[PDB]
PDB file of C-alpha atoms in Angstrom:
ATOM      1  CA  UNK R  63       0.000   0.000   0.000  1.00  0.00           C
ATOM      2  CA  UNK R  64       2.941   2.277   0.904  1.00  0.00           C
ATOM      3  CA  UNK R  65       3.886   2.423  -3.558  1.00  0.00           C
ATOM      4  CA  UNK R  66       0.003   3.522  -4.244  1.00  0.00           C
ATOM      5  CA  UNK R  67       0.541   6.087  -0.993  1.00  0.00           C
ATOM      6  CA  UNK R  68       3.336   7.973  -2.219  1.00  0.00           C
ATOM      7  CA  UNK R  69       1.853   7.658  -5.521  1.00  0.00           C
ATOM      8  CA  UNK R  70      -1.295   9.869  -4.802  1.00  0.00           C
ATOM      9  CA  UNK R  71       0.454  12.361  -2.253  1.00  0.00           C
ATOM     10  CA  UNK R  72       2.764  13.076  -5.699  1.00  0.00           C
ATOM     11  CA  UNK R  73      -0.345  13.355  -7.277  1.00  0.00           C
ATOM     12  CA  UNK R  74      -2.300  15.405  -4.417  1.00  0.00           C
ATOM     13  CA  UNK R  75       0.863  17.882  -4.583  1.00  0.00           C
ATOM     14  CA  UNK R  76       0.837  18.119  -8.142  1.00  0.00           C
ATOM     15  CA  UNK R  77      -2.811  19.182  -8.783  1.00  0.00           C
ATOM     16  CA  UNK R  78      -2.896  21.601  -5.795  1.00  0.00           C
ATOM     17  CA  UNK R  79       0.416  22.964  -7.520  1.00  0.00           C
ATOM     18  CA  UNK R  80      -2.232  23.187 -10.965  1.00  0.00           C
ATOM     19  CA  UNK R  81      -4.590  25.051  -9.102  1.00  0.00           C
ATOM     20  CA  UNK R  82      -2.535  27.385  -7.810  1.00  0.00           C
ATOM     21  CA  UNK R  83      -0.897  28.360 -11.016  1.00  0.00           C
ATOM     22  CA  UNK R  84      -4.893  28.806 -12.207  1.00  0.00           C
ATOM     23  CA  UNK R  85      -5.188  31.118  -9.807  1.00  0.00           C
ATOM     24  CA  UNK R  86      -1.881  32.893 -10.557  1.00  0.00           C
ATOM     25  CA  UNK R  87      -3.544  33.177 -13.916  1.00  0.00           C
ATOM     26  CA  UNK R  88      -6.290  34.723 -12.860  1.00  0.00           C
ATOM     27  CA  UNK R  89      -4.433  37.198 -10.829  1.00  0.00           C
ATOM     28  CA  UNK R  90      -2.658  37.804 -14.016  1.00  0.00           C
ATOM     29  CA  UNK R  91      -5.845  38.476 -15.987  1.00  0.00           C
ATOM     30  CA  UNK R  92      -6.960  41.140 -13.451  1.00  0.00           C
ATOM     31  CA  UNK R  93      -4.168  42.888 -13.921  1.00  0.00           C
ATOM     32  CA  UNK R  94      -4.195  43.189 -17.291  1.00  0.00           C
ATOM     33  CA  UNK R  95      -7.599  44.463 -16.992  1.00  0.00           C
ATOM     34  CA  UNK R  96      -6.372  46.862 -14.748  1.00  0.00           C
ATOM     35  CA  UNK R  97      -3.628  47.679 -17.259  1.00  0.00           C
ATOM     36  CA  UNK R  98      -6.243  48.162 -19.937  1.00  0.00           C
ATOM     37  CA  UNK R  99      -8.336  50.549 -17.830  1.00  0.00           C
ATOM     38  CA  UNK R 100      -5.087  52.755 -17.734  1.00  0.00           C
ATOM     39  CA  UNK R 101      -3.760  51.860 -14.566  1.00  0.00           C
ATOM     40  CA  UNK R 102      -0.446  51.672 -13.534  1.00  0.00           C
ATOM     41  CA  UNK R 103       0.702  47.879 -13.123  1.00  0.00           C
ATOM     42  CA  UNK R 104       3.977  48.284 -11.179  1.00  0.00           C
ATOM     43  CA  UNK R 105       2.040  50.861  -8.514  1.00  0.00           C
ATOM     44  CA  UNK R 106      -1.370  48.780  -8.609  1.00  0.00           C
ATOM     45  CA  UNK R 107       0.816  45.440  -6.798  1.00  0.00           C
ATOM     46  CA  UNK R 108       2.417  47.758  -4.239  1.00  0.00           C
ATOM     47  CA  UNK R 109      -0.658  48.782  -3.438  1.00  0.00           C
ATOM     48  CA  UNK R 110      -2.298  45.426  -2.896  1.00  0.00           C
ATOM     49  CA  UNK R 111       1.116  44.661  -0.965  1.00  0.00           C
ATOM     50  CA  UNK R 112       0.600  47.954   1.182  1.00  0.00           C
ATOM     51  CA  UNK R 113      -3.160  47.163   2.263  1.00  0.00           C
ATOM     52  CA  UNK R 114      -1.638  43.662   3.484  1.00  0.00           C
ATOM     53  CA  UNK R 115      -0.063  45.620   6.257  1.00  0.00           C
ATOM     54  CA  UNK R 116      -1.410  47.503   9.736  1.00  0.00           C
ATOM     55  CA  UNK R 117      -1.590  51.400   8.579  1.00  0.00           C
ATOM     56  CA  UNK R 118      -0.177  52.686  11.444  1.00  0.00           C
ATOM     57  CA  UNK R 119       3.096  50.438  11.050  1.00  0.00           C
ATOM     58  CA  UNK R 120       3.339  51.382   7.910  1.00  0.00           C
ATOM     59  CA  UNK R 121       2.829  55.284   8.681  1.00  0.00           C
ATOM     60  CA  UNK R 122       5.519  54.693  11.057  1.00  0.00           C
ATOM     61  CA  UNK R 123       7.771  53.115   9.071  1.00  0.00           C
ATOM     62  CA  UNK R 124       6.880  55.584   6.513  1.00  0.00           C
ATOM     63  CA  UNK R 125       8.271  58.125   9.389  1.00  0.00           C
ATOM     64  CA  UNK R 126      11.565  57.157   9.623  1.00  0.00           C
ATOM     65  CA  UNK R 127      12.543  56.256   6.337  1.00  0.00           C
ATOM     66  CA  UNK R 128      11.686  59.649   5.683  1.00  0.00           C
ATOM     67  CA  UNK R 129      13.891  60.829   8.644  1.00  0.00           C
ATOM     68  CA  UNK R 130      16.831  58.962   7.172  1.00  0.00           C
ATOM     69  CA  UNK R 131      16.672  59.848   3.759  1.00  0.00           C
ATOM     70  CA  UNK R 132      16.323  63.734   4.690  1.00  0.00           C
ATOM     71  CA  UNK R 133      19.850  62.646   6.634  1.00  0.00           C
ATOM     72  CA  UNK R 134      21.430  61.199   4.126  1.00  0.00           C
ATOM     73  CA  UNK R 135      20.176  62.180   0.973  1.00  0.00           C
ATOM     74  CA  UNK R 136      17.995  60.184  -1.784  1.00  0.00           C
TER      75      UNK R 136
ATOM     76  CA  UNK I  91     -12.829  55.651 -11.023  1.00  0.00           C
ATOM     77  CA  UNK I  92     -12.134  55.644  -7.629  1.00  0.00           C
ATOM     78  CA  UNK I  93     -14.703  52.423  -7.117  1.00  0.00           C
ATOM     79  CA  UNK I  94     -13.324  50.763 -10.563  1.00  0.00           C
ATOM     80  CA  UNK I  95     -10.189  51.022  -9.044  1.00  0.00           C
ATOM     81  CA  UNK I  96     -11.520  49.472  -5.475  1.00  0.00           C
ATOM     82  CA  UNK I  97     -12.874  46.871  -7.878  1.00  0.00           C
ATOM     83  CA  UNK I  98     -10.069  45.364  -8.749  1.00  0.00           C
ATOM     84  CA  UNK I  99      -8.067  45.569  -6.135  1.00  0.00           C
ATOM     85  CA  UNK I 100     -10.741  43.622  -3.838  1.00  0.00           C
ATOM     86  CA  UNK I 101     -10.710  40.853  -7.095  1.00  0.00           C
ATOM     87  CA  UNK I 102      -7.123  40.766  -6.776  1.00  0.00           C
ATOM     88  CA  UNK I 103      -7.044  40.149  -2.925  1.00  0.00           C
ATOM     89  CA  UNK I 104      -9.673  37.776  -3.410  1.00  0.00           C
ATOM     90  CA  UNK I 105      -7.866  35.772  -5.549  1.00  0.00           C
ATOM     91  CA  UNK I 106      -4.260  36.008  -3.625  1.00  0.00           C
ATOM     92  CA  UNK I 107      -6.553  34.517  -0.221  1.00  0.00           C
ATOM     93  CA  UNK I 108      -7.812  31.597  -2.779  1.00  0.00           C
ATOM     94  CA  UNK I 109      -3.725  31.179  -3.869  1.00  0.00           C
ATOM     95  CA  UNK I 110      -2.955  31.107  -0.331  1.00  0.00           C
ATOM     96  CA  UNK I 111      -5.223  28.589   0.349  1.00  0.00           C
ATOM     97  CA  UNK I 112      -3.913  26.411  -1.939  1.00  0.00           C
ATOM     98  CA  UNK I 113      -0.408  26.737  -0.702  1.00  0.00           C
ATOM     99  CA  UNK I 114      -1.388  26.028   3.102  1.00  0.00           C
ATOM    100  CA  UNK I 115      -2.887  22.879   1.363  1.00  0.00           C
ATOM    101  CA  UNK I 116       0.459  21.932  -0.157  1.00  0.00           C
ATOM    102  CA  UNK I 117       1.752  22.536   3.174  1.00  0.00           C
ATOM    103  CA  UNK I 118      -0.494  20.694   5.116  1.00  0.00           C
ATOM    104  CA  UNK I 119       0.066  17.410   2.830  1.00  0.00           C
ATOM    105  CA  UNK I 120       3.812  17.806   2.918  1.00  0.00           C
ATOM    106  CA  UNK I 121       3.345  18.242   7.189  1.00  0.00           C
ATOM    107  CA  UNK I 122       1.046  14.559   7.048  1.00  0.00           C
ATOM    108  CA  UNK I 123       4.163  13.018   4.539  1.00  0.00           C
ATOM    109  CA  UNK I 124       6.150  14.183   7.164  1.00  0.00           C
ATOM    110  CA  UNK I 125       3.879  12.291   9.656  1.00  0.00           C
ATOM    111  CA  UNK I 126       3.819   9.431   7.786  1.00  0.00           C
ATOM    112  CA  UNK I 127       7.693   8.759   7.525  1.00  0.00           C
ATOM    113  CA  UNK I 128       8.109  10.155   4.486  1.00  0.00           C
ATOM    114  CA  UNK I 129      11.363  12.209   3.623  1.00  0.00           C
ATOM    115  CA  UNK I 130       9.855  16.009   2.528  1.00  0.00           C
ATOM    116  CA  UNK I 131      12.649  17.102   0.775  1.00  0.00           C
ATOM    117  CA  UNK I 132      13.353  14.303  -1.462  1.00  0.00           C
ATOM    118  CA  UNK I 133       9.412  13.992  -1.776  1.00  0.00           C
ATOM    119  CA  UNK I 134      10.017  18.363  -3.327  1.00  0.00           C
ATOM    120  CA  UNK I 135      12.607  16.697  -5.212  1.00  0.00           C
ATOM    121  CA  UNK I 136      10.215  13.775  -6.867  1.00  0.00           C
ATOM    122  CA  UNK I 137       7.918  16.975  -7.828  1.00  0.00           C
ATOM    123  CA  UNK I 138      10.548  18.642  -9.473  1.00  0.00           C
ATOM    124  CA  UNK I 139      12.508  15.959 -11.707  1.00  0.00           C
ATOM    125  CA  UNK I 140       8.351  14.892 -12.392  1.00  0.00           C
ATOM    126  CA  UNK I 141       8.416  18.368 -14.667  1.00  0.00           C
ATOM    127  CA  UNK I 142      11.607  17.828 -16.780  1.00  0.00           C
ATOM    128  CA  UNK I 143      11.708  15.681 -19.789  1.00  0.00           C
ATOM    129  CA  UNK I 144      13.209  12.344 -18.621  1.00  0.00           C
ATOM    130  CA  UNK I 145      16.066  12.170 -21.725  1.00  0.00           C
ATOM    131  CA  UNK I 146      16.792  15.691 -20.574  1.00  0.00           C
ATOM    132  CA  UNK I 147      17.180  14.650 -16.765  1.00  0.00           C
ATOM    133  CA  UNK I 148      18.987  11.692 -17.712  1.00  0.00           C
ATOM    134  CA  UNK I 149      21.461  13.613 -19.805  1.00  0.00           C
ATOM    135  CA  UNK I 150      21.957  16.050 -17.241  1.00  0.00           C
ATOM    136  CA  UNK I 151      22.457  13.660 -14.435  1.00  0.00           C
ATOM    137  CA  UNK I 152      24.873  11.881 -16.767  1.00  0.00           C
ATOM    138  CA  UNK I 153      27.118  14.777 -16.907  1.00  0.00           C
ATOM    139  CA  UNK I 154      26.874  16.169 -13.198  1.00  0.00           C
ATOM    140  CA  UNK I 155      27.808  12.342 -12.354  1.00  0.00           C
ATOM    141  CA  UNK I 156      31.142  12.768 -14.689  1.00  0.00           C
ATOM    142  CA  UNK I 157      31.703  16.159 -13.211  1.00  0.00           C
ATOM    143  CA  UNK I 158      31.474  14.741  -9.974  1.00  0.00           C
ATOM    144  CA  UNK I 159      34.106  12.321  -9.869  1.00  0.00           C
ATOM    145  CA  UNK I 160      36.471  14.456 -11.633  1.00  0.00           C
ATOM    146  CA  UNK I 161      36.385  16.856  -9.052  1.00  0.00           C
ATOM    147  CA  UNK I 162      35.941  15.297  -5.903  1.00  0.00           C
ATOM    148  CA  UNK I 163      35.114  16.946  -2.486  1.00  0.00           C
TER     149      UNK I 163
ATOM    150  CA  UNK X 278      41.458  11.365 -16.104  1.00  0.00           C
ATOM    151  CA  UNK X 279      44.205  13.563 -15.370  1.00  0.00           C
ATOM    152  CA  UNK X 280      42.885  16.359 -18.153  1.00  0.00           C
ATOM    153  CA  UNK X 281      38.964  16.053 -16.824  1.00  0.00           C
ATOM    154  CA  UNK X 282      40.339  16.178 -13.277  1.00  0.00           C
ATOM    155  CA  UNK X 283      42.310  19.305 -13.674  1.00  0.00           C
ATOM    156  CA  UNK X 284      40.622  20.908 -16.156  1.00  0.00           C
ATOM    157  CA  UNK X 285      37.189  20.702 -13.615  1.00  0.00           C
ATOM    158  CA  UNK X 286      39.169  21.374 -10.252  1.00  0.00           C
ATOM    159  CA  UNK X 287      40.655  24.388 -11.615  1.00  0.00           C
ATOM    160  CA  UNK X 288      37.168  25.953 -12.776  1.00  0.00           C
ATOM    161  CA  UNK X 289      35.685  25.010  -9.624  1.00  0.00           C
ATOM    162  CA  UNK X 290      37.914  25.695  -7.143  1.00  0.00           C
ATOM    163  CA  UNK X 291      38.240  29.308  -9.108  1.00  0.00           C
ATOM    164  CA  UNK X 292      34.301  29.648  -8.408  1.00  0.00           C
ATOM    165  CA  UNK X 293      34.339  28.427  -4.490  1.00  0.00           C
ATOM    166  CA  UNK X 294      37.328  30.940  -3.708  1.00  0.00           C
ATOM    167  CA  UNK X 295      35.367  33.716  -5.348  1.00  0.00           C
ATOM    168  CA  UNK X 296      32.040  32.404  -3.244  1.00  0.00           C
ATOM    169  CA  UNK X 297      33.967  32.887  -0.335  1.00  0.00           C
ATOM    170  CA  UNK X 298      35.371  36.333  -1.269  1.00  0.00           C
ATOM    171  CA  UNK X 299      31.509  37.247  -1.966  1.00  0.00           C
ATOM    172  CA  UNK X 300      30.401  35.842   1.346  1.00  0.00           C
ATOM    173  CA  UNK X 301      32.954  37.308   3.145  1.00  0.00           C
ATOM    174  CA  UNK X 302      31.867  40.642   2.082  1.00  0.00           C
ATOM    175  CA  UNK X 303      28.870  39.864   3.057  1.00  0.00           C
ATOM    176  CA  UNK X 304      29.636  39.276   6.326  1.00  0.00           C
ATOM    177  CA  UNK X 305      31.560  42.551   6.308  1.00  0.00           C
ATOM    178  CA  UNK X 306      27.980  44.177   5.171  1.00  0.00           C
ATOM    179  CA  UNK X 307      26.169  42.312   8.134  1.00  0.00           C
ATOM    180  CA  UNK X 308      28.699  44.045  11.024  1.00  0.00           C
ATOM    181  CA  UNK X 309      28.414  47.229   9.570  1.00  0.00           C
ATOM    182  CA  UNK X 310      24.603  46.890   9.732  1.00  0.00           C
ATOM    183  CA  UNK X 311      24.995  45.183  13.421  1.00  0.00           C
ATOM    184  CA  UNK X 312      27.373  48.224  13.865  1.00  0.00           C
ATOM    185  CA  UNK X 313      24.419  50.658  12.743  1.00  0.00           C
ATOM    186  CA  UNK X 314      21.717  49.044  15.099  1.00  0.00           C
ATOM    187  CA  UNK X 315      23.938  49.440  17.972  1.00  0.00           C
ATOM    188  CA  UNK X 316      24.257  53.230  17.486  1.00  0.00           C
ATOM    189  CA  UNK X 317      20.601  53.102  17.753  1.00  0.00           C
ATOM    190  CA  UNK X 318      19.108  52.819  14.244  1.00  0.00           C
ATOM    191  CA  UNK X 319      16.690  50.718  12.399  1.00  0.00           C
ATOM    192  CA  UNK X 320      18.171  47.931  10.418  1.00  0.00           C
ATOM    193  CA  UNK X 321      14.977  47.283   8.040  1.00  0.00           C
ATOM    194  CA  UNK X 322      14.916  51.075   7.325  1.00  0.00           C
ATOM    195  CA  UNK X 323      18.725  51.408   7.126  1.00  0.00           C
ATOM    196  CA  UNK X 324      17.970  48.788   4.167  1.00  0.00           C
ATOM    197  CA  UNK X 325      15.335  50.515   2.631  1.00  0.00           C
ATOM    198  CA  UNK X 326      17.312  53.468   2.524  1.00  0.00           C
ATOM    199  CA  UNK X 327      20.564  51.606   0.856  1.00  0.00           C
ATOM    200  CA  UNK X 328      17.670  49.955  -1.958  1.00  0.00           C
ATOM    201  CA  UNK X 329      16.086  53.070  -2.238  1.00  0.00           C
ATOM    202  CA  UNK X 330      19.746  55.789  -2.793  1.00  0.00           C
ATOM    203  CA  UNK X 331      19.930  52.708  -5.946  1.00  0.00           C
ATOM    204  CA  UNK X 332      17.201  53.624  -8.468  1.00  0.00           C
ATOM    205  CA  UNK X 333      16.138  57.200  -9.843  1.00  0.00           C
ATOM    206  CA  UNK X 334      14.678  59.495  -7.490  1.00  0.00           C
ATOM    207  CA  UNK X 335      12.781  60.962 -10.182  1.00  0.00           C
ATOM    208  CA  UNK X 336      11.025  57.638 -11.019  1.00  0.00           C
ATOM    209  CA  UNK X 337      10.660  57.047  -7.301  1.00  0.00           C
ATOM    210  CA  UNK X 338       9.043  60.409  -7.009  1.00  0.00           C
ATOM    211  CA  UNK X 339       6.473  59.839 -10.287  1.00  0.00           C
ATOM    212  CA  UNK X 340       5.796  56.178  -8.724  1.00  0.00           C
ATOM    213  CA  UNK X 341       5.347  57.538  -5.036  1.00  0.00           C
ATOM    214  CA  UNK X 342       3.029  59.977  -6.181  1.00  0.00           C
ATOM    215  CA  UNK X 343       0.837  57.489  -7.944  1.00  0.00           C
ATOM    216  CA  UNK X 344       1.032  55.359  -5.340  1.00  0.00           C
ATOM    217  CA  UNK X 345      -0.577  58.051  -2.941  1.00  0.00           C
ATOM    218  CA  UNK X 346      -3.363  58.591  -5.502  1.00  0.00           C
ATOM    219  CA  UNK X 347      -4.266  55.133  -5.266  1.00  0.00           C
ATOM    220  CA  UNK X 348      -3.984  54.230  -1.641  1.00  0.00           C
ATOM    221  CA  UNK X 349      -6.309  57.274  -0.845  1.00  0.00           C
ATOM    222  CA  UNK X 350      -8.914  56.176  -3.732  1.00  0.00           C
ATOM    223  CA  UNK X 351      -9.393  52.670  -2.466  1.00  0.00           C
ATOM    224  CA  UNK X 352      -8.339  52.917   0.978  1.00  0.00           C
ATOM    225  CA  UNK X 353      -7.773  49.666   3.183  1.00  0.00           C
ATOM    226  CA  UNK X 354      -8.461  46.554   2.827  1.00  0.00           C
ATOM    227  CA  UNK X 355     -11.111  45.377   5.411  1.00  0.00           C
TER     228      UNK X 355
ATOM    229  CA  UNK W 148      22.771  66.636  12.794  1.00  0.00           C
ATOM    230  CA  UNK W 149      25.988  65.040  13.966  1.00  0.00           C
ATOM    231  CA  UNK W 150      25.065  63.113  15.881  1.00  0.00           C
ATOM    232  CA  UNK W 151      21.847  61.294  14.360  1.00  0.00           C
ATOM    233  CA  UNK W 152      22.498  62.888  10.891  1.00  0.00           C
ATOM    234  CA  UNK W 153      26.191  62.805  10.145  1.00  0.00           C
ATOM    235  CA  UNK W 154      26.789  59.440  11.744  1.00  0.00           C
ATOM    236  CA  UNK W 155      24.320  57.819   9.104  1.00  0.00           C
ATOM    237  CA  UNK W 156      26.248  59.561   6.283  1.00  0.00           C
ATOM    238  CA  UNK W 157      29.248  56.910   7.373  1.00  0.00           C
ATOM    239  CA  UNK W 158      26.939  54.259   7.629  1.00  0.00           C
ATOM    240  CA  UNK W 159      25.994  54.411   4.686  1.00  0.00           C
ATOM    241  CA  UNK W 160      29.324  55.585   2.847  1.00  0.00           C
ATOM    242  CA  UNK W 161      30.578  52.013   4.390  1.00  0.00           C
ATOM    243  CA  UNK W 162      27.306  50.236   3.259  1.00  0.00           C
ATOM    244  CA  UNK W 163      27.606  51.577  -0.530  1.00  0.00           C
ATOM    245  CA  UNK W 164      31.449  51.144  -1.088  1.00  0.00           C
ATOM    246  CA  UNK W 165      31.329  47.141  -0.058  1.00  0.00           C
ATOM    247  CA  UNK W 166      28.241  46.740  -2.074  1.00  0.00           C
ATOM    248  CA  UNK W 167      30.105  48.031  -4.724  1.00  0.00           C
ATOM    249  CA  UNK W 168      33.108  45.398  -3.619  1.00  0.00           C
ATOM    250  CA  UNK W 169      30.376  42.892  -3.880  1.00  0.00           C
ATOM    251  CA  UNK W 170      29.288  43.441  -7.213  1.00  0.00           C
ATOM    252  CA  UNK W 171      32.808  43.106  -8.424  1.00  0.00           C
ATOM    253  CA  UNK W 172      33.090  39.975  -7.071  1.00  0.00           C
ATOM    254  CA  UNK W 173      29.746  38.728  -8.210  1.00  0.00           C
ATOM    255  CA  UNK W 174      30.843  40.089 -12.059  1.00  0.00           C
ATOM    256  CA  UNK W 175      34.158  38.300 -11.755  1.00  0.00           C
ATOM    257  CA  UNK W 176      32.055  34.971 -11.105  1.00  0.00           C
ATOM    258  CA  UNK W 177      29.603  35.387 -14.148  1.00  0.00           C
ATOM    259  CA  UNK W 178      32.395  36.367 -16.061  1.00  0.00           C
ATOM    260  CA  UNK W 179      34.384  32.735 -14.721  1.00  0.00           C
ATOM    261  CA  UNK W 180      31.041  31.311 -15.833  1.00  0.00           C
ATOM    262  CA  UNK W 181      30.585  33.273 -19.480  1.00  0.00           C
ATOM    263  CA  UNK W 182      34.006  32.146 -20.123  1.00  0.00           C
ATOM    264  CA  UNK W 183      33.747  27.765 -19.254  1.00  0.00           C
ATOM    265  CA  UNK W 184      30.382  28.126 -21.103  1.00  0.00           C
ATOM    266  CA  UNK W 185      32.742  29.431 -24.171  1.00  0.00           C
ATOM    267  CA  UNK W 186      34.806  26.313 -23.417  1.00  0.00           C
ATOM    268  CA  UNK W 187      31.697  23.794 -23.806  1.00  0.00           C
ATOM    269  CA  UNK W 188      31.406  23.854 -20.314  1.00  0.00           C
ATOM    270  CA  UNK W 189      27.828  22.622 -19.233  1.00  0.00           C
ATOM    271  CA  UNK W 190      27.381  25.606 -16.717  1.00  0.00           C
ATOM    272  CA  UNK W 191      23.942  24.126 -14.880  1.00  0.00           C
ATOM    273  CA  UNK W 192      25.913  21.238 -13.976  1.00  0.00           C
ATOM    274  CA  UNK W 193      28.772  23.504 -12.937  1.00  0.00           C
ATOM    275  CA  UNK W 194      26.482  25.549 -10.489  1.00  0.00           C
ATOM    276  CA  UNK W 195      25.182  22.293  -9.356  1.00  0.00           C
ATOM    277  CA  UNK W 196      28.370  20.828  -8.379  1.00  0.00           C
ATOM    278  CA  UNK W 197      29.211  24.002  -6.756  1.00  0.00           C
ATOM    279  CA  UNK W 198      25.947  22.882  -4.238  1.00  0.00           C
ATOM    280  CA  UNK W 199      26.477  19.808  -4.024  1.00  0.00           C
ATOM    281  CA  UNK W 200      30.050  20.353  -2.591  1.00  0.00           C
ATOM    282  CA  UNK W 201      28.882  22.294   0.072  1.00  0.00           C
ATOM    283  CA  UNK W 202      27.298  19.696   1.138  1.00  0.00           C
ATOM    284  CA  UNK W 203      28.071  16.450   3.631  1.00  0.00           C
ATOM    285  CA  UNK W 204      28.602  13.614   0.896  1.00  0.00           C
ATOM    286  CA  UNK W 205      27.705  10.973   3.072  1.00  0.00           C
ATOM    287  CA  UNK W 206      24.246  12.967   3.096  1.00  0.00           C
ATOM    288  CA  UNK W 207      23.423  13.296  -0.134  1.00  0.00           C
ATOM    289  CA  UNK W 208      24.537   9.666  -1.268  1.00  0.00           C
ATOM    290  CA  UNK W 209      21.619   8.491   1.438  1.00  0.00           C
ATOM    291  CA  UNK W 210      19.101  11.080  -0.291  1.00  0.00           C
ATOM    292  CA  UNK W 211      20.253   9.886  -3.227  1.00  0.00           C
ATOM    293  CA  UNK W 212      19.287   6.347  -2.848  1.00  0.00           C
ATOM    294  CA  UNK W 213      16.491   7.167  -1.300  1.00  0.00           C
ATOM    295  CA  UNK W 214      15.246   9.578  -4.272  1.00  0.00           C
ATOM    296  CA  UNK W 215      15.595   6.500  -6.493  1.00  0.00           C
ATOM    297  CA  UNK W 216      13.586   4.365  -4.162  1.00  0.00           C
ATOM    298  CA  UNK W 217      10.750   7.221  -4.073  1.00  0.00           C
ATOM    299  CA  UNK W 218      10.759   7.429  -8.472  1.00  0.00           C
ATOM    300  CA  UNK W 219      10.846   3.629  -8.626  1.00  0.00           C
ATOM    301  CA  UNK W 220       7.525   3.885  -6.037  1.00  0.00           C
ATOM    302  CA  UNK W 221       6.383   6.184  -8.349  1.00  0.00           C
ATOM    303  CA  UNK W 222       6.895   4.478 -11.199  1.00  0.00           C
ATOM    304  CA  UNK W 223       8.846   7.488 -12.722  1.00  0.00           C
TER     305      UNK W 223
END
C-alpha cells in the first residue's frame, strides 16, 4: 500500500500545484484588466502589498525612512 | 474611477486569499508526509525531476555524475 | 582522467574561492549593519534606505506619487 | 545633525562602497562562468556541483538512494 501512498500524495501535490498556477492566472488576468483601464501595473501590486499591512506600522515606518533619507540624501 | 479602481483591487485580494489557500494545502500534505515517515525534501525533489523531460534529466544527471568524480570533495 | 580532473578542479575551485570572497563581504555588510543598530538605528529602514539611494529618485518620485493617488482612492483593505 | 544625521552619512558611505566590492566579485564569477560556457562547459551542472560540494557527501549519497527508491515507487 505504501507504492500507491506515495503515488497519490505526488499526485495530491501536483494538482494543488495546478490550481494554484490557475489562480496565478487569474491574478494575471486582473491585472491586465487593470492595465487596460489605464492603470499603472507596477504601482497597482504595491498597493495590494501595502493594504496587506497595519496602517499605522506602515505610517511609522513611513516616518523614519523619511527621517533617514532627509539625513542622508535620496 | 475611484470604485473601478476598489474593484479590482478587492478581485485581486480575493484571488491572492484563494492562492494562499492552496499553498497552506500543499503545506499541510507535505506536514502529514512528514507524519507518515516520508522524507519532505526528497518527496520536493520527486515533484521537481516529475516536470523535466526524462532524456533531458537523464542527460543532465549523466554529466553532473562525470563532473562529480572528476572533481571530488 | 588527469585532463577532466584538472581541467574541472581548476574551474571550480576558481568559483568556491570567489564564493567565499563574496560571502565574506557579506559578512563585512552584516557588522556594519549590526554596527548601525547598535548606534541606535533601524536595520529594516537602514535597508530601505541603501535599496532606495539605488534607483532614480525621479522615477521614485512619479511612482510615489501614484502610489498616494491610489492608496487614498481605495483605501484599506477590510 | 551630527550626531543622528552625520553618523548615518558613514553608515551608509561604508554600506555603498562594499556593495560596490560585492558586485565586483559577483561580475568576476559570471564572467568565470561566461568564459567555461565558451569552453563547452555545461554551466547548470557547474552551479550544481558548486551545491552539491557544500554539502556532507555521506548525506546526499543516502538522499540519493532514497530519491531512487521514491521514483521507482512512483513508477517514474
Amino acid at each position: 500500500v505504501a507504492g500507491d501512498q506515495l503515488k497519490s500524495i505526488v499526485e495530491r501535490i501536483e494538482r494543488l500545484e495546478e490550481e494554484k498556477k490557475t489562480i496565478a492566472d487569474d491574478i494575471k488576468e486582473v491585472y491586465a484588466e487593470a492595465k487596460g483601464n489605464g492603470y499603472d501595473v507596477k504601482v497597482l501590486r504595491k498597493v495590494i502589498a501595502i493594504r496587506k499591512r497595519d496602517a499605522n506600522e506602515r505610517a511609522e515606518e513611513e516616518a523614519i525612512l523619511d527621517l533617514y533619507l532627509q539625513a542622508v540624501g535620496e
